C-alpha cells in the first residue's frame, strides 16, 4: 500500500534512489531482497506509464 | 475553462484518508498511459470516469 499510494513522479525518483544505491555495493548487498521486492512491485504496478515515458536518461537508468 | 476526463484504474486502500473521502488513481483519456492521484467525495469504484477541472495538482492526504 505504501508503494501503491505514491504517484509516478515519486516512482521516478525512487528509481533514481535505486540507481544511486546500487553503486554503493555495501548497502546493496545487505538489502538485496528488499530492493528487489520494492523495485519489482513498483515497476510491475507502474508498468503501463513507465513504458510510455520517453527519456533516454530513464532508459539508461533502467539498464 | 477546458476540462478533462480521467478513468479510475485503482481505488487506493489503507491510505489514512478522512472519512467520506477516498483517494483514487486515475489515468487520462486523451493519453491513456499517464496517471495522477486524485481524491474523490462520493462512492467510487474502478473503471469509472470522473471529471477534473484541473490536472496540475497531485493529491495529498486529507486527515
Amino acid at each position: 500500500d505504501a508503494l501503491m499510494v505514491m504517484p509516478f513522479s515519486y516512482v521516478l525518483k525512487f528509481l533514481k534512489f535505486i540507481d544511486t544505491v546500487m553503486q554503493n555495493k555495501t548497502l546493496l548487498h545487505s538489502h538485496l531482497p528488499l530492493i528487489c521486492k520494492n523495485l519489482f512491485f513498483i515497476i510491475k504496478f507502474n508498468h503501463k506509464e513507465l513504458v510510455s515515458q520517453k527519456n533516454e536518461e530513464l532508459k539508461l537508468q533502467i539498464n | 475553462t477546458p476540462v478533462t476526463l480521467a478513468k479510475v484504474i485503482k481505488v487506493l486502500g489503507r491510505t489514512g484518508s478522512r472519512g467520506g473521502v477516498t483517494q483514487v488513481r486515475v489515468e487520462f483519456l486523451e493519453d491513456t498511459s499517464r496517471t495522477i492521484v486524485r481524491n474523490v467525495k462520493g462512492p467510487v469504484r474502478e473503471n469509472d470516469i470522473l471529471v477534473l477541472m484541473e490536472s496540475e495538482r497531485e493529491a495529498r492526504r486529507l486527515r
Binding site: 500500500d1 505504501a2 508503494l3 499510494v5 | 489514512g16
Partner: peptide
C-alpha cells in the same frame, strides 16, 4: 502522525 507511503514520499 504520518503513515507508510507518505513517510517514504517525504523521505
Amino acid at each position: 502522525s504520518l503513515k507508510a507511503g507518505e513517510r517514504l514520499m517525504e523521505a
